[PDB]
Protein backbone atom coordinates (compact mmCIF):
# COMPACT_ATOMS: atom_id res chain seq x y z
CA UNK A 1 0.00 0.00 0.00
CA UNK A 2 3.07 2.22 0.33
CA UNK A 3 6.76 2.37 -0.52
CA UNK A 4 9.07 0.52 1.88
CA UNK A 5 12.74 1.51 2.03
CA UNK A 6 14.42 -0.80 4.56
CA UNK A 7 11.49 -1.93 6.68
CA UNK A 8 11.58 -5.00 8.94
CA UNK A 9 9.05 -7.24 10.65
CA UNK A 10 9.65 -5.37 13.91
CA UNK A 11 9.41 -1.89 12.40
CA UNK A 12 6.22 -2.57 10.45
CA UNK A 13 4.46 -3.62 13.66
CA UNK A 14 4.20 -0.03 14.93
CA UNK A 15 4.79 1.94 11.69
CA UNK A 16 1.45 1.66 9.87
CA UNK A 17 1.08 4.91 7.92
CA UNK A 18 -0.60 7.50 10.13
CA UNK A 19 2.50 9.70 10.15
CA UNK A 20 3.10 11.77 6.98
CA UNK A 21 6.52 10.40 6.01
CA UNK A 22 5.82 6.89 7.29
CA UNK A 23 7.58 4.39 5.01
CA UNK A 24 8.58 1.82 7.63
CA UNK A 25 12.27 2.79 7.63
CA UNK A 26 13.28 1.95 11.22
CA UNK A 27 16.19 -0.51 11.04
CA UNK A 28 17.25 0.39 14.60
CA UNK A 29 13.77 0.18 16.12
CA UNK A 30 14.07 3.60 17.75
CA UNK A 31 10.29 4.21 17.75
CA UNK A 32 9.24 0.92 19.36
CA UNK A 33 6.48 1.75 21.89
CA UNK A 34 7.45 -1.14 24.19
CA UNK A 35 10.48 0.71 25.57
CA UNK A 36 9.34 4.32 25.27
CA UNK A 37 11.29 6.68 27.50
CA UNK A 38 12.35 10.30 27.79
CA UNK A 39 13.28 11.33 24.25
CA UNK A 40 13.22 7.91 22.55
CA UNK A 41 9.46 7.47 22.27
CA UNK A 42 6.76 7.71 19.57
CA UNK A 43 5.51 11.12 20.75
CA UNK A 44 8.83 12.99 20.49
CA UNK A 45 10.77 11.52 17.56
CA UNK A 46 8.35 12.68 14.82
CA UNK A 47 8.25 16.12 16.45
CA UNK A 48 12.04 16.27 16.68
CA UNK A 49 12.25 15.15 13.05
CA UNK A 50 9.89 17.93 11.99
CA UNK A 51 11.78 20.60 13.94
CA UNK A 52 15.24 19.49 12.80
CA UNK A 53 13.84 19.39 9.27
CA UNK A 54 12.34 22.88 9.43
CA UNK A 55 15.56 24.37 10.76
CA UNK A 56 17.37 22.41 8.04
CA UNK A 57 15.06 23.91 5.41
CA UNK A 58 16.01 27.34 6.69
CA UNK A 59 19.68 26.32 6.77
CA UNK A 60 20.00 24.77 3.31
CA UNK A 61 18.19 27.75 1.77
CA UNK A 62 20.17 30.18 3.93
CA UNK A 63 23.69 28.77 3.90
CA UNK A 64 23.72 29.15 0.10
CA UNK A 65 21.36 32.10 -0.52
CA UNK A 66 23.87 34.95 -0.06
CA UNK A 67 26.39 33.21 -2.32
CA UNK A 68 23.82 32.64 -5.09
CA UNK A 69 22.44 36.17 -4.80
CA UNK A 70 25.95 37.61 -5.04
CA UNK A 71 26.77 35.38 -8.00
CA UNK A 72 23.74 36.72 -9.87
CA UNK A 73 24.76 40.16 -8.63
CA UNK A 74 22.07 41.83 -6.53
CA UNK A 75 23.58 41.80 -3.01
CA UNK A 76 26.93 43.43 -2.13
CA UNK A 77 29.85 41.15 -2.93
CA UNK A 78 31.35 41.53 0.55
CA UNK A 79 28.15 39.99 1.96
CA UNK A 80 28.28 37.29 -0.76
CA UNK A 81 30.44 34.88 1.22
CA UNK A 82 30.33 31.17 2.08
CA UNK A 83 28.29 30.29 5.14
CA UNK A 84 31.25 29.23 7.29
CA UNK A 85 32.96 32.61 6.71
CA UNK A 86 30.04 34.63 8.14
CA UNK A 87 31.37 34.61 11.72
CA UNK A 88 29.75 31.30 12.70
CA UNK A 89 33.28 29.85 12.80
CA UNK A 90 35.56 32.88 13.33
CA UNK A 91 38.80 30.96 12.66
CA UNK A 92 37.88 30.03 9.07
CA UNK A 93 36.31 33.45 8.52
CA UNK A 94 34.76 36.39 10.36
CA UNK A 95 32.42 39.27 9.52
CA UNK A 96 31.90 42.52 11.43
CA UNK A 97 28.20 43.06 12.14
CA UNK A 98 26.59 45.80 14.23
CA UNK A 99 27.34 43.72 17.34
CA UNK A 100 30.05 41.24 18.20
CA UNK A 101 28.96 37.61 17.72
CA UNK A 102 28.80 36.87 21.45
CA UNK A 103 26.43 39.78 22.09
CA UNK A 104 24.47 38.55 19.07
CA UNK A 105 24.52 35.06 20.60
CA UNK A 106 23.16 36.35 23.91
CA UNK A 107 20.38 38.21 22.09
CA UNK A 108 19.68 35.09 20.03
CA UNK A 109 19.56 32.99 23.19
CA UNK A 110 17.09 35.38 24.83
CA UNK A 111 14.76 35.53 21.82
CA UNK A 112 15.00 31.83 20.98
CA UNK A 113 14.46 31.04 24.65
CA UNK A 114 11.26 33.06 24.75
CA UNK A 115 10.11 31.16 21.65
CA UNK A 116 11.48 27.68 22.38
CA UNK A 117 10.40 27.48 26.03
CA UNK A 118 6.87 28.39 24.96
CA UNK A 119 6.98 25.73 22.25
CA UNK A 120 8.16 23.20 24.85
CA UNK A 121 5.45 24.17 27.33
CA UNK A 122 2.85 23.73 24.60
CA UNK A 123 4.30 20.31 23.78
CA UNK A 124 4.26 19.09 27.38
CA UNK A 125 1.05 20.89 28.44
CA UNK A 126 -1.00 21.61 25.30
CA UNK A 127 -3.02 24.82 25.31
CA UNK A 128 -1.12 26.27 28.27
CA UNK A 129 0.25 29.18 26.20
CA UNK A 130 -3.22 30.62 25.57
CA UNK A 131 -4.12 31.39 29.20
CA UNK A 132 -1.50 33.59 30.86
CA UNK A 133 -1.25 37.18 29.68
CA UNK A 134 1.44 37.67 27.03
CA UNK A 135 1.36 41.23 25.61
CA UNK A 136 -2.28 40.53 24.73
CA UNK A 137 -1.50 38.13 21.85
CA UNK A 138 -1.46 34.94 23.92
CA UNK A 139 -4.70 34.01 22.14
CA UNK A 140 -2.88 33.66 18.81
CA UNK A 141 -0.33 31.27 20.36
CA UNK A 142 -2.82 28.64 21.52
CA UNK A 143 -1.93 25.87 19.10
CA UNK A 144 -3.88 22.73 18.34
CA UNK A 145 -3.92 19.12 19.52
CA UNK A 146 -0.82 18.29 17.49
CA UNK A 147 2.31 20.05 18.84
CA UNK A 148 4.10 20.10 15.48
CA UNK A 149 1.20 21.87 13.71
CA UNK A 150 -0.18 24.79 15.74
CA UNK A 151 -1.97 26.33 12.76
CA UNK A 152 -3.06 29.51 14.50
CA UNK A 153 -3.83 32.91 13.02
CA UNK A 154 -0.08 33.63 13.10
CA UNK A 155 1.48 30.25 12.29
CA UNK A 156 -1.15 29.80 9.54
CA UNK A 157 -2.20 33.18 8.12
CA UNK A 158 -2.72 32.16 4.49
CA UNK A 159 -4.92 29.30 5.72
CA UNK A 160 -3.62 26.24 3.90
CA UNK A 161 -5.09 22.81 4.47
CA UNK A 162 -8.78 23.70 4.65
CA UNK A 163 -9.56 20.09 3.70
CA UNK A 164 -7.90 17.08 5.29
CA UNK A 165 -6.62 15.41 2.10
CA UNK A 166 -4.66 18.45 0.90
CA UNK A 167 -3.54 19.04 4.49
CA UNK A 168 -2.10 15.52 4.76
CA UNK A 169 -0.45 15.70 1.33
CA UNK A 170 1.10 19.02 2.33
CA UNK A 171 2.36 17.40 5.54
CA UNK A 172 4.02 14.65 3.51
CA UNK A 173 5.60 17.24 1.22
CA UNK A 174 6.91 19.15 4.24
CA UNK A 175 8.45 16.01 5.74
CA UNK A 176 10.13 15.07 2.46
CA UNK A 177 11.57 18.53 1.85
CA UNK A 178 12.76 18.60 5.46
CA UNK A 179 14.57 15.28 5.18
CA UNK A 180 16.17 16.50 1.95
CA UNK A 181 17.27 19.75 3.62
CA UNK A 182 18.73 17.84 6.58
CA UNK A 183 20.79 15.66 4.26
CA UNK A 184 21.76 18.82 2.36
CA UNK A 185 23.07 20.51 5.51
CA UNK A 186 25.09 17.40 6.33
CA UNK A 187 26.50 17.65 2.82
CA UNK A 188 27.24 21.34 3.40
CA UNK A 189 29.25 20.49 6.51
CA UNK A 190 31.24 17.63 5.01
CA UNK A 191 31.94 19.56 1.79
CA UNK A 192 32.99 22.61 3.81
CA UNK A 193 35.61 20.50 5.56
CA UNK A 194 36.74 18.56 2.48
CA UNK A 195 36.70 21.39 -0.11
CA UNK A 196 37.13 24.74 1.65
CA UNK A 197 34.63 26.54 -0.61
CA UNK A 198 30.90 27.17 -0.52
CA UNK A 199 28.23 24.70 -1.64
CA UNK A 200 27.43 26.71 -4.77
CA UNK A 201 31.11 26.72 -5.69
CA UNK A 202 31.15 22.93 -5.37
CA UNK A 203 28.03 22.67 -7.54
CA UNK A 204 29.57 24.86 -10.24
CA UNK A 205 32.87 22.96 -10.10
CA UNK A 206 30.99 19.69 -10.60
CA UNK A 207 28.88 21.19 -13.39
CA UNK A 208 32.04 22.42 -15.15
CA UNK A 209 34.10 19.19 -15.24
CA UNK A 210 32.03 16.46 -13.55
CA UNK A 211 34.59 13.66 -13.91
CA UNK A 212 37.57 15.62 -12.50
CA UNK A 213 35.59 17.50 -9.81
CA UNK A 214 33.99 15.04 -7.39
CA UNK A 215 34.60 13.37 -4.04
CA UNK A 216 37.21 11.02 -5.51
CA UNK A 217 39.32 13.82 -6.97
CA UNK A 218 38.63 16.28 -4.14
CA UNK A 219 39.47 14.36 -0.96
CA UNK A 220 42.90 15.99 -1.29
CA UNK A 221 41.27 18.74 0.82
CA UNK A 222 42.80 21.70 -1.01
Amino acid sequence: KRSLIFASKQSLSYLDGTLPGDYGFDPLGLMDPEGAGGFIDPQWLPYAEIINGRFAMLGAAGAIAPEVLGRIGLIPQETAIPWFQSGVIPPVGNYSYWADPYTLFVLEMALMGFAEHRRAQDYYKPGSMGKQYFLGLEKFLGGSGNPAYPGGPIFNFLGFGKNEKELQELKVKEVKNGRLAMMAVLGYFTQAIFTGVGPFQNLLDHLADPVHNNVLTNLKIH
Binding site: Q10, G29, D32, E34, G35, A36, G37
Partner: peptide, 9 residues
Protein backbone atom coordinates in the same frame (compact mmCIF):
# COMPACT_ATOMS: atom_id res chain seq x y z
CA UNK B 1 15.55 -8.98 20.05
CA UNK B 2 18.02 -6.23 21.01
CA UNK B 3 15.96 -3.11 21.71
CA UNK B 4 15.83 -0.11 24.03
CA UNK B 5 13.65 -0.76 27.08
CA UNK B 6 13.16 1.66 29.98
CA UNK B 7 10.62 2.47 32.68
CA UNK B 8 9.34 6.00 33.23
CA UNK B 9 9.66 7.54 36.70
Amino acid sequence: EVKIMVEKD
